Design an enzyme around this catalytic site. Structure first.
Site, short mmCIF file in Angstrom:
data_model
loop_
_atom_site.label_atom_id
_atom_site.label_comp_id
_atom_site.label_asym_id
_atom_site.label_seq_id
_atom_site.Cartn_x
_atom_site.Cartn_y
_atom_site.Cartn_z
CD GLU A 1 -19.15 -8.47 15.92
OE1 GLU A 1 -19.97 -8.74 15.00
OE2 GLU A 1 -18.49 -7.42 15.91
CB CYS B 1 0.94 -22.04 22.13
SG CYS B 1 2.43 -22.80 21.38
CD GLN C 1 1.59 -20.47 25.77
OE1 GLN C 1 0.99 -19.90 24.87
NE2 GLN C 1 2.57 -21.34 25.54
CG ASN D 1 -0.90 -15.06 21.93
OD1 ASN D 1 -0.62 -16.27 21.94
ND2 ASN D 1 0.01 -14.13 21.98
CD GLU E 1 -6.94 -24.67 27.69
OE1 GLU E 1 -7.05 -24.73 28.94
OE2 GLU E 1 -7.78 -24.10 26.97
CG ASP F 1 -4.45 -30.79 7.90
OD1 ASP F 1 -4.56 -30.24 9.01
OD2 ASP F 1 -3.88 -31.89 7.74
CG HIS G 1 10.37 -11.50 15.35
ND1 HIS G 1 9.63 -12.50 14.80
CD2 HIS G 1 11.55 -11.44 14.63
CE1 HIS G 1 10.31 -13.04 13.77
NE2 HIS G 1 11.49 -12.40 13.67
CG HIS H 1 2.78 -18.82 19.55
ND1 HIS H 1 2.85 -19.32 20.79
CD2 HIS H 1 1.86 -17.77 19.59
CE1 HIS H 1 1.99 -18.64 21.59
NE2 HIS H 1 1.39 -17.70 20.85
CD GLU I 1 1.09 -32.07 37.16
OE1 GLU I 1 2.16 -32.55 37.60
OE2 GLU I 1 0.48 -31.11 37.70
CD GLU J 1 -3.05 -27.89 38.20
OE1 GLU J 1 -2.32 -27.09 38.85
OE2 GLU J 1 -4.24 -28.14 38.52
ZN LIG Z 1 4.18 -20.55 21.81
#
Ligand SMILES: [Zn+2]
Ligand SMILES: [Zn+2]
Lengths: 220, 220
Positions: free
Chosen positions: A9, A25, A19, A187, A50, A114, A140, A163, A96, A92
């Protein structure tokens, strides 16, 4: 902290990305956190590369499509003196040779922080910083086929979470009386996954899926 | 064995199903193998109940949506004296009380055969038996977002394979000169996943993803 936070927002969050066939990720999680902090700093929401992370952050400990850590990506941006835009250095889904070009750098960081391994501490960070990079157990089918509501998986691990994702807020569901708190998580599995690419993860239920155990944000 | 086998052409294989938010892939793998053997026996292709397996095969070692083994499902069908049709006992993607009704049993088995842990042995079994139940390492985004071609993942494990699937054949790709062999694998992640719900898995490349390590079929 407030009872509910949603940084989308406030303009901190880019649309959901995908990805694809690559264990990248961590890179999506890191650019999401850096997109949030750069927006806080400049008022410009800019999609970050990324691919730049996948290709170039080997020296800091990352392994391209075979995994990595958000902290190592934040360390790379510091060492490298910048990070290219998504537009200048497109995705991509394969590692590379490094093609970083400082002419197209749109982001910087001076390191990272952290967060202590507690959901209380994660909540204070989400409330006051912006979107937070985190690692979860996503392994899962209950997560693969998540569609709506608060995700809860009784077999979820709080160790070695695989992940990398992005906490963009938290909240609670009114219509449910017990276990109604959630983290709002972006995600990197496309818009078609989950709730427009988002998942509400069980909050304050014994660190479900290890969500508070590897949380961090870049300093910009 | 022949150079290429595809049991779908012979009528042994039902359309692709979707396990949803439940770790019940073992059940889908087991019904697929039993669908194949029942068709061989009777000439009737009948979709079998995964839910019947999820609900009722606890005593043989399975744990509903929290995992199981194809051998335990084959053992249950033997002990139980039957298995209900998909139609009579539909899929709910959650474990509930056993509701087996022998009036609607459409399948039987007298046990199972475990195959030696070699791709040579798996190939002879696929060639001469029909579809074979197997477990693979499916825990990479390269598999989640697989679309076409021969799947190969350099981080694939051949130990503790999590995900029960069905080998329905094998073949080779003409247009590629090296590493051109594959297993033809039915998944239980819907028709929209992979190639119409199928994946070509690397064959004879050091037991890629542990595909030959937990292979079996029911005796009918
Ligand atoms: Zn992952
Ligand atoms: Zn599975």
């Amino acid at each position: 902290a407030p009872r509910s936070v949603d940084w989308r927002e406030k303009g901190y969050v880019t649309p959901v990305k995908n990805q694809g066939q690559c264990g990248s990720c961590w890179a999506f999680s890191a650019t999401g956190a850096l997109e949030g902090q750069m927006f806080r700093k400049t008022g410009r929401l800019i999609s970050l590369s990324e691919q730049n992370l996948v290709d170039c952050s080997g020296p800091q400990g990352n392994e391209g499509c075979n995994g990595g850590l958000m902290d190592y990506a934040f360390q790379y941006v510091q060492d490298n003196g910048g990070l290219d835009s998504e537009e200048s250095y497109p995705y991509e889904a394969t590692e590379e040779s490094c093609k970083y070009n400082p002419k197209y750098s749109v982001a910087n960081d001076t390191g990272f922080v952290d967060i202590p391994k507690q959901e209380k501490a994660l909540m204070k960070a989400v409330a006051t910083v912006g979107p937070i990079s985190v690692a979860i157990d996503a392994g899962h089918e209950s997560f693969l086929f998540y569609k709506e509501g608060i995700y809860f998986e009784p077999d979820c691990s709080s160790e070695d979470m695989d992940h990398g994702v992005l906490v963009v807020g938290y909240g609670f569901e009114s219509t449910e009386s017990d276990n109604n708190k959630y983290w709002l998580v972006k995600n990197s599995w496309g818009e078609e996954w989950g709730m427009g690419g988002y998942v509400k993860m069980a909050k304050d239920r014994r660190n479900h899926c290890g969500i508070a155990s590897a949380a961090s944000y870049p300093t910009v």
